[PDB]
Design a protein around this ligand. Structure first.
Ligand SMILES: CC(=O)N[C@@H](C(=O)O)[C@@H](O)[C@H](O)[C@H](O)CO
Ligand SMILES: [Zn+2]
Length: 478
């Protein structure tokens, strides 16, 4: 009869894009137990949300937090943005199922150091998660590149049919053990020689488990539209849910092509369930890639193992100091991290406004000077693009990081403020919410978020990240 907590008089967004409704929200244990008029109800704790907004906890659909959640269960970078659930294992790289013969192949170093990959089966990863749990829920995809590395010593080639068969079985086992689906990162060196038929070889296993396919496209530059055909073909052949990761048209050649990306979804054929996600910035981030070096836009070096004295500098400035070309400078800087200001802001706005588009940070948790998307993505959508820019309403912005995302990833009883769903919740000031992380100060926490609950326990409150550790591993339904 009594409940743990009642949030009073918040402006409540249900997560479905519907208009907010002023009402009260009752939490008991892990669940939203009552909605609406709750002065009758008996609550241990009472939260005065007057002048504030309540929304479902934010679902970061594009993370590389596979190992971060284990090293850093508090997950301040995500929790301080209001993120209550992370989707791990993106762009073909995951922490499990993985056995490392030698070093971790590029770009698996984005996840952690070689010694951290102790999860040969997915269940070992889940068990590792369950030791402490974390402030966020975890739903895990399996990385295609990671699977290739399990069965290939030389990755600069297609897998053999027999290697494909091994990987199928590894994926199938991972899917049975809880994984949500498969991800690829076909633009990366160690996956790029994987033909489309190799990716196709996973479709029957995915369909069997009613699992997801997500893809960092084979290219995001001139031939991005050809690369999207590959993703759609997965959906056409197998009728599975497909999500194109951090949708963009990168490169000076391609600025203004966002309408073409949108119209490309008209070529899906029979089905039309393909989705996508983006981060709210006109700059990408990854390791320094010689193929992306250009003087067409700013490229900012975030770290260099060869030349750490040149970290946090523009490639053009490093090149000038060094008396050599940008490409030659980049070569001497490798291995290195970079922020590539390769995208056009109007393209970003259009891709963000696209109703298929979920918000994902693509935060890189191992970068010593991260792209600020690691710390600002979700409040930037809410404060910058919604409130300030007016690209979309607050209900729309919230929908694209809660209900749309729970639906597309089939996260049961999450992403929506509804009775009987889990109490992942964020309490924030619609007028104050904003990202503070800049390209210079990229770990500055966002403003305007007052309180976060993961599964009914408070993981953030009044600028403090709290180690409730109430997240769960969200195992796939099958
Ligand atoms: C880890 C990761 O996948 N990062 C991508 C991103 O930040 O969007 C990046 O690799 C981009 O694909 C390229 O820089 C071209 O834009
Ligand atoms: Zn990617």
């Amino acid at each position: 009869q009594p409940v743990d907590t009642i949030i009073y008089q918040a402006k409540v967004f249900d997560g479905l894009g519907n208009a907010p409704v002023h009402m009260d929200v009752a939490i008991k244990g892990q669940q939203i137990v009552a909605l609406g008029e709750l002065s009758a109800y008996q609550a241990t704790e009472e939260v005065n949300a007057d002048g504030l907004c309540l929304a479902p906890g934010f679902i970061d659909v594009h993370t590389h937090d596979d190992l971060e959640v284990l090293r850093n269960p508090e997950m301040a970078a995500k929790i301080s943005q209001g993120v209550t659930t992370v989707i791990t294992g993106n762009c073909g790289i995951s922490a499990a199922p993985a056995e490392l013969a030698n070093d971790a192949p590029d770009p698996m170093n984005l996840l952690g150091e070689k010694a951290e990959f102790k999860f040969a089966q997915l269940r070992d990863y889940i068990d590792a998660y369950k030791v402490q749990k974390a402030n966020v829920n975890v739903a895990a995809l399996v990385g295609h590149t990671t699977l290739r590395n399990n069965v290939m010593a030389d990755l600069l080639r297609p897998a053999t049919a027999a290697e494909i068969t091994l990987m199928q079985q590894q994926l199938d086992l991972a899917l049975s053990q809880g994984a949500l689906g498969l991800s690829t990162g076909l633009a990366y060196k160690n996956a790029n020689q994987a033909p489309s038929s190799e990716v196709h070889a996973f479709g029957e296993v995915l369909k069997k488990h009613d699992a997801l396919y997500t893809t960092h496209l084979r290219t995001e530059f001139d031939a991005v539209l050809d690369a999207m055909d590959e993703a759609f073909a997965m959906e056409q052949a197998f009728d599975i849910k497909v999500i194109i990761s951090h949708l963009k048209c990168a490169g000076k050649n391609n600025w203004g092509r966002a309408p073409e990306l949108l119209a490309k979804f008209s070529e899906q054929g029979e089905h039309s369930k393909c989705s996508c996600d983006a981060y709210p910035y006109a700059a990408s981030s990854s390791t320094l890639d010689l193929n992306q070096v250009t003087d067409d836009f700013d490229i900012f070096i975030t770290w260099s193992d060869s030349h750490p004295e040149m970290a946090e500098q523009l490639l053009a400035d490093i090149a000038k100091q060094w008396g050599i070309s940008l490409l030659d400078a980049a070569k001497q800087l490798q291995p290195a991290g970079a922020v590539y200001h390769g995208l056009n802001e109007d393209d970003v706005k259009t891709i963000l406004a696209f109703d298929k588009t979920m918000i994902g940070s693509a935060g890189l948790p191992c970068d010593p000077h991260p792209h600020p998307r690691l710390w600002g993505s979700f409040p930037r959508v809410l404060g910058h693009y919604s409130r300030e820019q007016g690209i979309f309403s607050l209900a729309t912005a919230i929908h694209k990081m809660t209900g749309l995302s729970a639906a597309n990833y089939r996260l049961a009883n999450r992403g929506v403020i509804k009775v009987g769903h889990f109490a992942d919740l964020v309490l924030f000031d619609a007028d104050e919410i904003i990202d503070n992380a800049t390209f210079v100060e990229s770990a500055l926490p966002a403003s305007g978020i007052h309180q976060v609950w993961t599964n009914g326990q408070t993981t953030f409150k009044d600028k403090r990240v709290l180690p409730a550790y109430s997240g769960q591993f969200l195992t796939s339904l099958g």
